[PDB]
Symmetry: D2
Subunit: 217 residues, 4 copies
């Protein structure tokens, strides 16, 4: 794909609502698609000003499978989708009743990926790890990719690590849709490592770094 | 509650997204809070114009427990919440993988209830009853109300009736929050009947009528 | 149904396993099918002797919809099933990860119903309400009955009440199968009240009383 | 662990019930614990004689993490558990409503592992892949192992491959308990490949081969 180069730029815009708290997020990043790495800086603006009202980790994974190292042989569903574009839909089912739904569109112009998302979370316990910001980040995960009904699906039981050392379970279910038909890959897995680094006390300013590599199973 | 009268008016505004389709909804209605009845007319405007892209039944229940006939003895959690106001958070877990999250705020001025909501649905099968608009409406349901952690929770396994006669299961989980502390009711059930009537072919123009009555259990 | 009389007797046998603890249960009861009431006494024998290792409430609902007051007009799926017999399959999905599956067969000879069941529970938290026997009984519930694929299904979000006053959620999903085809009823609800009374300290000896009435919806 | 040798033998006994169909299973196998491999032959005897009434794949994973290649550095929760023994509890939540619960105990005498299990499945659609025996086997999976409340938990979204090429989703949740306290490992993943080979037309006679390797994450 002559459209996806070795070095890419990214820009993000998110409109969201968690437990009634409205917010918007802006971000900018840089990435190496073939190497499976990317880093970005985000700014969360709560509708009512003030610090981030919940754990940024519920948003991190929403902020691009094109940033995955795929073996040169295997069909790269994500890379093939450009320049037409892709849409993503993800369900997050947390173990304590909290549920978040997120949907986003990724477009590309030149070396720049524009990511526009909508995020909505409800029913998180007022004192749980999400609302109390007790999480540290996602443990490495192996997302199972399967082809289902012409599109690629991703399923994985992920874990958000907690301050004291515990873990908080989240089931992820995602639909990866392409604007145009692409050559489908075989069922596989994507190993991902995502690290979050708060830049300010409130957590409104934050950095994310991710490394992802696909494995033939 | 001298604040809630025998005849009330309602106005609605919804911002939503289902399977990537953005839309907004406006509505107006009239209701009898003590009698447990209400009727309203809505107008859906898809971001990209055109007919309603999915079943309006996924939105109907989002569009006010104040419209419930409660025995005069029993604490009315909803009526007591005004004029301060209330917030609602509902998770809809559909049997075929579709998930919708919705959150809304209800305020009151004089005899008018203003309802502002956000709705987000993802992962609905492209050919399921929701996206193909194959539903007719919700069967009558008995929502179980329980008090949990200072707020009222609602849980119920509901069924969306289908054109050919079948049914499509949906698990509802809702948090009913009041702006100010109110006298809590005992665990109870709310029997509800909601009827949808399309006013136009596309379904963008639609009427809803609902009857709800609380029962001591 | 000349086969189901006004006064019936019941006998029960259950083989079960909960969290690795094997046990058997024997019971005997009396009931009034048309009145929707029944009472029975059970004896639990843990494989390793000793007191009941978990809350009997997880078993109570396993121990006969024939004991439901149905309007004379409405098809009685359960009563019509005899004398041929019926089989039941129920999934119990508890809110804290515990899951129980149960299957049973009911046969009839004269005025006596023989109930043979198998119960299996796993993953209950070692310190949860089930293993610590912190429950008091089920709150009244409204089981939604729907016809699906030639058989009757029952769905309901039930609540087990806890000693201190709290509640523990359980989603029930049941398949009610008849040995022979019967006239199907319309979707309806069954209101049930079940009361448990421990006869001994260990809870191995226990009494159950239930009242159920069907309602056209 | 001088107790677990390079070559081990295995014997199995299972008592089960799926959709009302009672059965028992006997088996014998050989394995290489340090190499992470094992092979066994099983014989299913349906209570009512006749061919296997459902897909053997729902049972395969029930039939020993000791057969996993663990890096010599990392604590091997399973190997350390012997000779005292271990107990397992697994919940299988299938995508089409079928649910199976299974619990088993593994003991060791000399070079022989004795595996005694109980399996119970209910609510599988009469025409689904399980009851119609339309599955071919499990796709390779990465089970996430986490330490929770003194015991090891396993969570994974697995997929049963279907005859025509499709896949059928199953969420697995397992508790791995040891008779005696052992040194806990860090959160990790176990990559497993299990292959089923029917030895007879009915599928009552079947062979299983599995390869598992643990990975530090």
């Amino acid at each position: 794909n002559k459209f996806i180069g070795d070095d890419m730029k990214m820009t993000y815009h998110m409109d969201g609502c968690v437990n009634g708290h409205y917010f918007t997020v802006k971000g900018e990043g840089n990435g190496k698609p073939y190497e499976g790495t990317q880093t970005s800086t985000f700014k969360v603006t709560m509708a009512n000003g003030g610090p981030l009202a919940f754990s940024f980790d519920i948003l991190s994974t929403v902020f691009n499978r094109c940033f995955t190292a795929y073996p040169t042989s295997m069909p790269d569903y994500f890379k093939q989708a450009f320049p037409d574009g892709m849409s993503y839909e993800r369900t997050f089912t947390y173990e304590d009743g909290g549920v978040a739904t997120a949907s986003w569109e990724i477009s590309l112009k030149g070396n720049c990926f524009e990511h526009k998302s909508t995020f909505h979370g409800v029913n998180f316990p007022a004192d749980g790890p999400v609302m109390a910001k007790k999480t540290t980040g996602w443990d490495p995960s192996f997302e199972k990719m399967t082809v289902c009904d012409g599109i690629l699906k991703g399923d994985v039981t992920a874990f958000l690590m907690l301050q004291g050392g515990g873990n908080y379970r989240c089931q992820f279910h995602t639909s990866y849709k392409t604007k145009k038909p692409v050559t489908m890959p075989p069922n596989h897995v994507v190993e991902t490592r995502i690290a979050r680094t708060d830049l300010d006390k409130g957590g409104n300013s934050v950095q994310l770094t991710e490394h992802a590599v696909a494995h033939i199973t």
